[PDB]
Amino acid sequence: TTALVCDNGSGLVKAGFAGDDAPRAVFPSIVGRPRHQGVMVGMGQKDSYVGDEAQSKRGILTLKYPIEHGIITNWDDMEKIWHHTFYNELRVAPEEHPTLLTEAPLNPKANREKMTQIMFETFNVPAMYVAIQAVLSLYASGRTTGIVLDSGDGVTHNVPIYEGYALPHAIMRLDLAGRDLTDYLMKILTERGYSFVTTAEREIVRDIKEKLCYVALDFENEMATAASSSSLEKSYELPDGQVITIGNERFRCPETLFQPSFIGMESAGIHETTYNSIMKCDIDIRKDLYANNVMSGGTTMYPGIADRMQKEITALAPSTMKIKIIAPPERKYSVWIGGSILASLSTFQQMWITKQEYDEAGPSIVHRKCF
Amino acid sequence: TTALVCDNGSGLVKAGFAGDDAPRAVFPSIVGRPRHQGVMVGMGQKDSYVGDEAQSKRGILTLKYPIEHGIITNWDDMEKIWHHTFYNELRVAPEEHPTLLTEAPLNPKANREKMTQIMFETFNVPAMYVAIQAVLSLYASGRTTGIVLDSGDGVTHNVPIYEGYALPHAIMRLDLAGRDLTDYLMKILTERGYSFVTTAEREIVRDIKEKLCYVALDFENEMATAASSSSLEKSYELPDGQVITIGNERFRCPETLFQPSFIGMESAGIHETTYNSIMKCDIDIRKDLYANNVMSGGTTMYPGIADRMQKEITALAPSTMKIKIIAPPERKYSVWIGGSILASLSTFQQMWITKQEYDEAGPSIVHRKCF
Amino acid sequence: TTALVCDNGSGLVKAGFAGDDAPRAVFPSIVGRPRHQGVMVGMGQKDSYVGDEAQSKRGILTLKYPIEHGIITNWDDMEKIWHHTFYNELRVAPEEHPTLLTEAPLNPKANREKMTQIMFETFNVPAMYVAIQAVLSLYASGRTTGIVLDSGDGVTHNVPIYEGYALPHAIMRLDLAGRDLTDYLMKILTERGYSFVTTAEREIVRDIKEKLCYVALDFENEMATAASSSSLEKSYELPDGQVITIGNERFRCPETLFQPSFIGMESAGIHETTYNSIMKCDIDIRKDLYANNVMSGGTTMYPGIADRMQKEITALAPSTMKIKIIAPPERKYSVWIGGSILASLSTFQQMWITKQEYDEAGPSIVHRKCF
Amino acid sequence: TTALVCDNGSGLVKAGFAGDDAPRAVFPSIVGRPRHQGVMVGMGQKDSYVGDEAQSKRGILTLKYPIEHGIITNWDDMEKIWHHTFYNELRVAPEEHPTLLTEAPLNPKANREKMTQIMFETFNVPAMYVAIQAVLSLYASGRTTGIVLDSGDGVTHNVPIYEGYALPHAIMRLDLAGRDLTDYLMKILTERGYSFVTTAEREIVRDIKEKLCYVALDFENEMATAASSSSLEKSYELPDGQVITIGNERFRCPETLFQPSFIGMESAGIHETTYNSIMKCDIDIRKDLYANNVMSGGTTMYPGIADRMQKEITALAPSTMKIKIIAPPERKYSVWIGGSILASLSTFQQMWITKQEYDEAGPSIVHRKCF
Amino acid sequence: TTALVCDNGSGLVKAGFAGDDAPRAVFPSIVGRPRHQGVMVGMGQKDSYVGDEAQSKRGILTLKYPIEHGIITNWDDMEKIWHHTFYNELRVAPEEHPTLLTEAPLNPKANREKMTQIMFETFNVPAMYVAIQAVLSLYASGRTTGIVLDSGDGVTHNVPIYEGYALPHAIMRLDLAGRDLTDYLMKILTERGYSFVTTAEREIVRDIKEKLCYVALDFENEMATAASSSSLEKSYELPDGQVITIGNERFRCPETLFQPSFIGMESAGIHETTYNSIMKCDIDIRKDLYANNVMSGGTTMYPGIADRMQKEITALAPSTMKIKIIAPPERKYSVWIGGSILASLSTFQQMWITKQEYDEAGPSIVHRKCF
Amino acid sequence: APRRSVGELRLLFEARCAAVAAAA
Ligand SMILES: Nc1ncnc2c1ncn2[C@@H]1O[C@H](COP(=O)(O)OP(=O)(O)O)[C@@H](O)[C@H]1O
Ligand SMILES: Nc1ncnc2c1ncn2[C@@H]1O[C@H](COP(=O)(O)OP(=O)(O)O)[C@@H](O)[C@H]1O
Ligand SMILES: Nc1ncnc2c1ncn2[C@@H]1O[C@H](COP(=O)(O)OP(=O)(O)O)[C@@H](O)[C@H]1O
Ligand SMILES: Nc1ncnc2c1ncn2[C@@H]1O[C@H](COP(=O)(O)OP(=O)(O)O)[C@@H](O)[C@H]1O
Ligand SMILES: Nc1ncnc2c1ncn2[C@@H]1O[C@H](COP(=O)(O)OP(=O)(O)O)[C@@H](O)[C@H]1O
Ligand SMILES: [Mg+2]
Ligand SMILES: [Mg+2]
Ligand SMILES: [Mg+2]
Ligand SMILES: [Mg+2]
Ligand SMILES: [Mg+2]
């Protein structure tokens, strides 16, 4: 039976059958529960709403994300998100379809174990696998060698790979991504009095972030330009028709990827952690990593982020190195497309965790077979 | 059928058909095995890489040399190097081509026996021979009389010869060669902080040694000049574009051939062991050995080594003796060129170990026939 | 005037007067600079904090080590560490006290020169010397003959010695030590979700490493025991009272000394590099090196490390050899105690670099006199 | 005052007072000088070690023999060996004790002169004499008639004697002895890969030679037996506990005494030179030389050497001659025992070179008085 | 056809056609066989070198003389020397040329018989004769009356002759000649450490003997002069350019002709045996023998030998006798020149041993016809 | 000094071996 690929990343579920060019179910990884009284009988007023249901009811629900910093914090609601994914969105019975899950690297083994338990005992799936998201992101590009930069909703991670052979000591994970960008955008939009505090408003500032924000090529000069002229200001219309206007916040928000100290995060920026990841690699392969930086994940979609990243690494890396960034279109879906390739690759059909292996070895099997 | 010449010296295999002017396969005698995880399926990820394959993948492989100090330590990998030599590089079935092997003198009889076993029972070759590399080096120089100084990757040896008639008591072998020079170059490059420690980095310092190093004509005055001025410094560019700069290391590295005490080796230098080898010869022939010093092997390629050797032996030898050094171009390939001559010589066709003789006498035959 | 011994190793400064039994100033070689805003005036808010000052303020400072892999990377901060050592901790004016510095072997000559420049021109010290740390480690044991294995915060090195006469070709340095153990412990503590990422958290994982970790005697069976039973688990209390629990990480961390491939380091383990160092020695003295393995440096303090090292070398070394390891108590301070001996030895008072010799010969003098 | 006997042969000094049954100081005639750096102060690290001192420190010293082929090549070190002999071993002031030296025949007159100069002007000895070692070897047997075969470390010589009256034209000296046997044993132990190259290893192969080697009675049949069966193999344990195994090398080593062409020496063997020495004698006395072969010197200690020598001379000599070999126990010390007799013989007290005669006649006196 | 004269004396063959003034082939009577392992192609097909070829390859050959003390010891090699003489040097077919051989007197009849057999059955020569060398030496002088003193390489002999009529009872032969002088020169050159032991070195000491040596006129006073001053020392250059210096050895070597006891030879000297030979002659002819001492053979070429011989015989002979010595130039070739005369004398053509007489009488014929 | 091919070097040892075979 045709395999099934379900990228339970943070923020958005991407799911669909293997061999498809694009995920046929993309929806937010949100569970919403009614916030207010149940005044009006004659309706189901049902206890919980997920995905587009929760977005359609956003302003009466306490929205919550059950996966936080790439870690599933709330298995009771994540199992609802998987139920919704299979039965309501994909409209398929999982007991026929081996499911390629995926997760970020350097992630608690309790997560991979609970995902295994849930897939094999709640959904009875015939087989399962848990690929590293960055390894999947190569397949969607066709590379065998490269730095992968995945930057999601909850986590950002670098995984260097060379003809295969991911270098596990050189992997880095940052815990800085689109949620920290949303919360900092809310904090700086407070500087001119757009008080956003509810999770519905957090979900609107996520849209403001996606629609308006961009990455400055030269942050000091863009900040000076936004200070000297209104040309960089943009107006946006809230769901109630209130217009807001935004200025240097528009690029100060995604700049925090390059300057984490803006959110008080001590870590080196994403350009510096990319360079330091190449510097953890053996000196022979670094030239091909510089020649093959692959960018993936939704927070790499900002206009100019590839140009800024190339400038910053060309300033970091030795002057001869041909720094090149592979940041294609649809790089938001590249992790899913890589899973759609891998799950349909004929060599991969050896690799599944079969349910017989789970009945023999329990959750511990997925540390032995999967990378 | 045309004979086959395969100089399994250390460091580089030189192989090719007899009667050719130059070896048509020259590649490093390296077997490399993947160092890291096997993350990326959909590839052969094959268990082992040899020669230029291993160099092309250098920074993900644990490179190893299966022949060390001219002694084959690792027959399972040496048999891979021979398989690669015959089937992939020369693209020939050895069961049609009698193979002239060669080895250094004063070498364990177990090696010559295991080479015989492998050639006659793995490769089924019609016939085989194991010439001493230094004897071949006279054929490549058209000489019938001389000291030969061969200085390879793993061993250095002196063999005096007079109208034929190698003097076996005057042979000397030093166990000091290009690997000890590479490792000492690594040790002294540590003195200004270029830490090279992996075998990939050892393989880069071999390139630094080949590109930059030279032999000082007057080591004390060259050391004083490098101390007083930067004129002797040269810059080199590592595979990742990091520039390094090198100074007195440039001639301190190959100086250890003349001063083995730099690597803690107790023995007399190569000039002193050359003189002592002539001094083991009968007093009538010494004048023609002085008139016929033949230099061969890659570590004789250093600029100025012939001039330094001539100075040092002219200081050792009696003032009347016309000390002359035959250090031609292509002296790196002279052992193979000598094998190409000998294997194609009309009278040598008596000398092969036939497979009938191996079936009659086992590995012991190659001590009876070969010198 | 009584000499002064200042072991500017990595991670911890050990300093005190010569002839004392123990260093009277031991503090971390850390410089910390305020990370956050300066909100509260009416205080000095001073630009920099060092040592216990920086530990007492850890969670608001960007801690940095100015000496990295035994190499001083940050002279502007190292000169602060020396200033703090002399004026704040030891409370002494260096212009009266000749200072015995020490450094690891196979270390950039620029370091020994800059230390000389700083000591003679910033601190005006009457005289100075730079002993090799492993040579000092013999004096604290009372040996005259032995391999010394020093394993610090930044570097690990082996130095064999026989009645004197250190064998410089047999010295080995590994660049693997307590910082690589701390960072690997952080990487594996991520496997159950204790995300430590700040340098303050790195400094807490250093404490977890010191308190809980131990070296397994039989790593496969200890790993199987930790997999089969919780008996090996230990609980630790973070500075905020969050309890953590640790299991196979407890011995997987220091096991990387014996299996560097866990951190992707290619080199042979510390037992193998100890054996290979003995194997570089002349065959007569090897029996006394086996009989005199001296262990020093803080990362030799792990429980069971002497037993594991003895097992591994007894498996490597010939069956007759009486493998003995001298791993006494206070071996953490043995390098300083050896300096306290040497600096107060009456034979050593010839050996100081006097300031007159520096005025005659500049920084280059310290390569001529010191080993 | 009681005379003093100091057998400065090659390889071992044998010394002691006259009239003693055995030399009370036997130690190797070696001077060793430190090979490596002087890292560890607080010790004398003294410039030179001699005899058992040098053996006890063997693996850090460049050992040298100052007497080579029975010729003193290095008077500055030989004078150290004499100083050690008199003041440290025998613990006696030579200015009270007339010293019987001895040397091989057919030896440069510069040696006998320099020994005279050194004894009379450095050591101020009251009197001196320089007996021929083979003439001394008769006294230890009690013969007056015989052909003495002395075979030392550096030289082997035959001296026929008849009631007195050494026949000086029939003396022969071979320059082949225990050092050539040691070096050939090293060369053939290289045939199975025990690479010995340092002088410390030369000094170990001397021990292997003394412990294991023996002289084959019928070399072709012993060689065939060692080829057909391992029964002749013996195992030996190197100072580091590495076991080596030795086979046909065990008798191929001392066979070179009978077949000098193995080391490229052209001369007739020791049996042939013994026969040719008898053949230089007048035909009447040959029967008593055949009846009185006397063997002496350490290289006559090989098991079976007397049987092989008797077989070979019985094959050379006429069938009627009663070939007899006097090869007693302690024949290693027979030259010293002969000196202990001669120096204490009352007839010999006329023969001393008095210091008055040296003050009258210079070094030339010792050619006039001594034979 | 022109007769052929072939003086197979010892050491040098002199050969040439009769009637020529000088032998056109002079070369050493040496056969040399390779001493060493022939490793190269282009050797060993030729396995025995003769004459000047053996000198040109001296240092790789065991040189041997097949005629020793004027006696042919090695007919298989002497037949090679004759083959070389006829076919390679003189380039002539002996079956056309009657050959005058010659030999010393008082010589085993087996030699003269085997020479006859070889000449008539191997070389098929038409006729042959075997003149006494001393009788030939008269013809080259033109005497009919005289003492002849022939002193060769192997033998010295005196033959008195008077108008014809050699006195066979007064013939004397000494067995002391140039080989005993060479070997004694080697023995005394050992006294200052020029160790010559190989036959190549024996062949060099023959050159030293020819170049430097001379006969002292007054041996005691020449010995005292060489002891008191270096004026008699001469320097000579060995084939490898090593200079040697020689002093009283220069005349002590040929003095052994006058004092055979130096080599232990019992006999009276050559002056005494000359006088005793005259004293065996009838008293009437002694005055003409004293007036006609003829000296011949290479060892009469020493400078001053005629003066010393005249002094010694004038001291032996009665004061009135006019002692005269005919020691002309070319007296080295006088035996051959005498054969060149005799073989071309018309009276001599009766004297040949014809092949018909050999076919009738076998080897015994040469005792009947020849003297 | 100029190069010479393996053919010329072979011709050297062929000529030498012929010379010794004639001398033998
Ligand atoms: N065009 C865009 N511009 C900026 N941010 C975007 C864009 N599209 C998506 N994002 C942000 O990226 C995150 C979703 O990325 P995604 O790759 O779906 O997460 P994951 O890697 O967990 O699957 C969200 O925070 C979203 O706001
Ligand atoms: N141009 C050069 N200059 C200096 N060293 C060289 C050069 N070319 C090769 N080498 C060194 O010589 C060694 C290889 O010599 P080679 O003759 O191939 O070995 P072998 O004698 O075992 O066949 C290596 O150590 C290599 O680094
Ligand atoms: N008891 C202990 N157990 C384990 N590790 C320790 C212990 N004490 C110190 N260490 C570690 O050893 C290192 C400090 O060693 P030290 O000898 O002070 O360094 P250096 O050799 O540079 O002076 C630090 O990484 C520290 O965490
Ligand atoms: N038992 C033995 N078997 C074989 N060789 C021996 C034995 N004892 C001593 N030798 C060798 O004999 C030599 C020493 O002989 P010695 O007589 O002491 O020398 P010298 O004649 O110069 O005094 C050394 O080479 C030593 O190795
Ligand atoms: N000028 C010379 N001075 C001294 N010795 C010589 C001289 N020429 C030849 N001899 C010696 O004489 C010997 C050769 O004499 P020769 O007459 O040729 O021998 P034969 O009498 O057998 O023919 C050799 O030992 C040679 O060294
Ligand atoms: Mg994702
Ligand atoms: Mg080679
Ligand atoms: Mg330390
Ligand atoms: Mg002796
Ligand atoms: Mg003659």
Numbering used by the authors:
A (entry chain A), B (entry chain C), C (entry chain B), D (entry chain D), E (entry chain E): 5 to 375
F (entry chain F): 17 to 40
Text from the published report:
Actin filaments (F-actin) are an essential component of the cell cytoskeleton involved in numerous intracellular processes, including cell movement, division, and maintenance of cell shape. F-tractin, a 43 amino acid-long peptide, is an alternative to Lifeact for the visualization of actin filaments. The peptide consists of residues 10–52 of the rat actin-binding inositol 1,4,5-trisphosphate 3-kinase A. F-tractin labels F-actin structures without causing female sterility or significant actin defects during Drosophila oogenesis and has been proven to reliably report on F-actin organization in primary neurons without notable effects on cell function. The C-terminal helix interacts with a hydrophobic pocket formed by two neighboring actin subunits, an interaction region shared by many actin-binding polypeptides, including the popular actin-binding probe Lifeact.
By mixing F-actin with the peptide immediately prior to application to the grid, we observed a sufficient number of individual actin filaments for single-particle cryo-EM analysis. Indeed, after removing 49% of the particles, we obtained a 3.2 Å reconstruction that allowed us to build the atomic model of the F-tractin-F-actin complex. The 3.2 Å structure reveals that F-tractin is composed of a flexible N-terminal region and an amphipathic C-terminal helix. The RMSD value of 0.4 Å between the central actin subunit of the previously published structure of ADP F-actin and the central subunit of F-actin in complex with F-tractin indicated that F-tractin did not alter the structure of F-actin. We were able to unambiguously build amino acids 17–40 of F-tractin. The 16 N-terminal residues, which include six prolines and glycines, could not be resolved due to their flexibility. Following the flexible region, the next five residues (APRRS) form a structured loop, with Arg-19 forming a salt bridge with Asp-25 and Glu-334 of actin. The peptide continues as an extended α-helix that spans two adjacent actin subunits along the same filament strand. The interaction interface between the helix and F-actin is primarily hydrophobic: Val-22, Leu-25, and Phe-29 of F-tractin fit into a hydrophobic pocket formed by Tyr-143, Ile-341, Ile-345, and Leu-349 of one actin subunit, and Met-44 and Val-45 of a neighboring subunit. Additionally, Arg-32 forms hydrogen bonds with Thr-148 of actin, further stabilizing the complex.
